[PDB]
Amino acid sequence: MNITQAAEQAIRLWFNTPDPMQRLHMAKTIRTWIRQDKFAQVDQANMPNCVQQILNIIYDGLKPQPVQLPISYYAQLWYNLLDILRRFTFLPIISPYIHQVVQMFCPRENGPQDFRELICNLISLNWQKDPHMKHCANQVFQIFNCIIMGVKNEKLRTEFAQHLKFEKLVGTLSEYFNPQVHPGMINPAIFIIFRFIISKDTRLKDYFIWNNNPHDQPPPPTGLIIKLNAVMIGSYRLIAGQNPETLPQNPELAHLIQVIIRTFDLLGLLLHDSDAIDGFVRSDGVGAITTVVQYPNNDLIRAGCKLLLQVSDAKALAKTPLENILPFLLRLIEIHPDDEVIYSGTGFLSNVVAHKQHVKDIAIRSNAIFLLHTIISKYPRLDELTDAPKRNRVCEIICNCLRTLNNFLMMWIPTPNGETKTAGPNEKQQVCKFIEIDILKKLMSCLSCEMDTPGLLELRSTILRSFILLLRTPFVPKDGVLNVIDENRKENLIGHICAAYSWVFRQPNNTRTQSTKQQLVERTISLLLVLMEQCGAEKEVAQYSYSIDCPLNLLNGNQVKPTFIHNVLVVCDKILEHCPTRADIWTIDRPMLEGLTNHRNSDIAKAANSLLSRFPEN
Amino acid sequence: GDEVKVFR
């Protein structure tokens, strides 16, 4: 008897041969046949039921047999059947029939006799300490990995995902995240599966996090926030003293690092909204991340900082002790040579200081403002960066730094409300660095460089804001500012403001960017005003604004914002006081301006008729 | 008001 004939006897006889020892022999036989022949002699049109026959035997073999048998026996039988099953999930010749594999997972009884429950039972954690069964477990993890990484058809993916969502399986997987389990026990496939069932299932995320408890309570110890945190930390504890130079020859260290990285990735997926990230922060997540990223490994650091970025807008960060975390993170941003880390860190900094005075104070005492100056200064002009991905990154980085700056400068600008804070000499020297000529040149060149970068619009809007706030800051010397001329365009700040303003009108019309374009326009008008007043340069601003067409035409739409209208009226009037002939050259909607003379607001009305008297009688 | 950016 050859293998082909022996395998076919085995297949034909399986269901009427209940004897355990013969069943084992038959399984080896079928496996051997498959390993060797690879279905090549089987007619293509018969393949569907050839596969079904085998699948039906795999399933039957995994069922308990009433005769009591040693674990050694079952591990050997199942190892053979699971190895066949594994092969079905990667073998090219079987790939068109893979939906039959997936269909096996579909529940028929909704109980322990179902294929999915037998399978999921084989990856039970307590099997991992059994000498024979651990090998069956490892094989089932490979089967999950192969199907999840393998199947391309999206409807099939969706089906398989649904089959996996049952309490027994999520329970089983979660037991690997229990505090008492050594993290070396954690098969990476456990992450693949969690990622897979969680994907696009908002409520599954909430089931894992909250376990049906109130979103304002401390996240439950039965849920993933507490569990994933203890796994992060448990792994950190074991790698902490380990020299990273051993990595290439230290598989245990490699495995734990990878466990930490996939835990960061999984938490990233779980924390979908505000309630989740606030839960994470109340469970000391931010402290946990910052502790773990002390380990010198860049993938690990990149992944930790990515998650920090994601949770940075949490209101709970107003209650977290930041006296140690924040200086550590500033130090990291200062020395870490890779832009992704700088991007994440500065992004985090901008959100964490927002609306939180005591946090601003911590940052200032650790020289946060000085550091912003250093980060912006280290990069070339945006026009000197060739690769689009990297140019956009630098752009988002500078944008982060200036947004952080702007959250600081609020403190010190006179608010009628009565909270006029006084800057100390420490704050003063840090802030005043931002009017040094080198950074002014770089900032004005971002404003006017001529490239296709998605972040550019938001950057130019943020820069205008920075200048607005700097120039309204009492201790900032303003006398040198309009004397700074760039090497490239031979223009001063006014010329650069005017270039950004022109640029924005040539940009594509797109409801995504409309809001930001409007804010850039407003900030332009508002910055020209500030420059006029604060640098005593009313003449200079007006005559250096010949590049700008009649600002009054900005009001031709349904512009309802009262401060914008007033600004537009006032700037126009001040331009015509010094460049009288522009009144005859501009083309205005005169009846609209007359309308504004009788406006509810008295400031607007006063500006309107003052501006009206400038024009010909026509 | 201070400015907050959502990175999600």
Give me the CATH number covering residue A582.
Answer: 1.10.10.1630
CA dist A190 and A174 (Å) reads: 9
Chain A hits for B8, Cβ within 8 Å: 272, 310
Cβ within 8 Å, pair A351-B8: no
Q: Are residues A80 and A114 in the same domain?
A: yes
Q: Are residues A292 and A342 in the same domain?
A: yes
**Where is the domain boundary, A529, A550, A571?**
A550
Q: Are residues A482 and A561 in the same domain?
A: no
Q: Are residues A211 and A277 in the same domain?
A: yes
CA dist B6 and B8 (Å) reads: 6
Whole-number Cα distances in Å, A417 to A99, A135, A414: 68, 71, 9
Q: Choose from A280, A407, A417 for mutation: most chain B CBs within 10 A.
A: A407
Minimal Cβ distance to A310: which of B1, B3, B8: B8
Q: Are residues A504 and A416 in the same domain?
A: yes
Long-range Cβ contacts of A106-110 (<8 Å, 24+ apart): A106/A159, A106/A163, A107/A163, A107/A166
CB atoms within 10 A of CB A352: 29
Helix A115-122 to helix A134-150 angle, to the nearest 10 degrees? 120
Are residues A485 and A492 in contact, defined by beta-carbon separation less than 8 angstroms?
A: yes
- What is the three-class DSSP state of A149? helix
Cβ within 8 Å, pair A347-B4: no
Helix A368-377 to helix A357-365 angle, to the nearest 10 degrees? 70
Chain A hits for B4, Cβ within 8 Å: 313, 351, 354-355
CATH of the domain at A540: 1.25.10.10
Residue of B nearest to A353 (CA): B2
**Where is the domain boundary, A550, A583, A610?**
A550
CA dist A233 and A283 (Å) reads: 13
Residue of A nearest to B7 (CA): A310
Cβ within 8 Å, pair B3-A272: no
* Number of separate domains in chain A: 2
Q: Are residues A48 and A76 in the same domain?
A: yes
Q: Are residues A497 and A591 in the same domain?
A: no
Q: Are residues A601 and A533 in the same domain?
A: no
Cβ within 8 Å, pair B2-A410: yes
Question: Number of helices (H) and strands (E), helices first, in chain B?
Answer: 0, 0
Closest by alpha carbon to A482, among A450, A433, A427, A530? Answer: A530
Q: Are residues A187 and A315 in the same domain?
A: yes
For the record, the structure tokens of A518 come out as: 């409007």
E-only strand ranges, A534-590? none
Q: Choose from A269, A271, A393, A403 for mutation: most chain B CBs within 10 A.
A: A403
CB-neighbour burial class of residue A162 (10 A; exposed 0-12, middle 13-18, buried 19+): middle
Q: Are residues A120 and A184 in the same domain?
A: yes
CA dist A223 and A225 (Å) reads: 6
DSSP A110: S
Alpha-helical regions (H) of A165-314: 167-174, 189-198, 202-210, 224-239, 251-270, 274-282, 285-292, 298-311
For the record, the structure tokens of A374 come out as: 């250093």
- What is the three-class DSSP state of A334? helix
Q: Are residues A336 and A431 in the same domain?
A: yes
Are residues A83 and A122 in contact, defined by beta-carbon separation less than 8 angstroms?
A: no
**Where is the domain boundary, A550, A576, A600?**
A550
Burial A406-417 (b: 16+ CB within 10 A, else e): bbbbbbbbeeee
Residue of A nearest to B8 (CA): A310
Instruction: Answer left, alpha or beta for residue A381, where phi above 0 means left and psi between -120 and 50 means alpha.
Output: beta
Question: Number of helices (H) and strands (E), helices first, in chain A?
Answer: 31, 0
Q: Are residues A544 and A558 in the same domain?
A: no
Measured in residues, chain B has a length of 8
Q: Which residue has the tokens 């500065």?
A: A346
Q: Residues of A near B (CB-CB distance < 8 A)?
A: 272, 309-310, 312-313, 347, 350-351, 353-355, 400, 403, 406-407, 410
CA dist A529 and A460 (Å) reads: 18
- CA-angle at A423, arms to A417 and A425, nearest 5°: 175
- What is the three-class DSSP state of A216? coil
B positions 1-8 inside 8 Å of A (CB): 1-8
CA dist A118 and A313 (Å) reads: 44
- A322 to chain B, minimum CA–CA distance in Å? 18
Residue type at position A453: T
Domain holding A504, by residue range, is 2-550
CA dist A375 and A398 (Å) reads: 8
- B1 to chain A, minimum CA–CA distance in Å? 8
DSSP A508: P
Closest by alpha carbon to A363, among A411, A396, A302, A397? Answer: A411
How crowded is the C-beta side of A367, counted as CA atoms within 13 Å? 11
How crowded is the C-beta side of A468, counted as CA atoms within 13 Å? 22
CA dist A67 and A373 (Å) reads: 77
For the record, the structure tokens of A268 come out as: 């990233």
For the record, the structure tokens of A601 come out as: 């607001």
CA dist A565 and A246 (Å) reads: 66
CA dist A451 and A457 (Å) reads: 11
Minimal Cβ distance to A347: which of B1, B3, B5: B5
CB-neighbour burial class of residue A248 (10 A; exposed 0-12, middle 13-18, buried 19+): exposed
Closest by alpha carbon to A458, among A510, A514, A505? Answer: A514
CA dist A369 and A360 (Å) reads: 10
Are residues A553 and A546 in contact, defined by beta-carbon separation less than 8 angstroms?
A: no
Cβ within 8 Å, pair B6-A313: yes
Are residues A472 and A420 in contact, defined by beta-carbon separation less than 8 angstroms?
A: no
Torsion sign (Cα): A457, A460, A466, A469: negative
CA dist A358 and A565 (Å) reads: 36
For the record, the structure tokens of A445 come out as: 């060149």
CA dist A130 and A70 (Å) reads: 13
Are residues A428 and A491 in contact, defined by beta-carbon separation less than 8 angstroms?
A: no
CB atoms within 10 A of CB A101: 23
CA dist A237 and A4 (Å) reads: 54
Torsion sign (Cα): A67, A73, A74, A78: negative
- B3 to chain A, minimum CA–CA distance in Å? 6
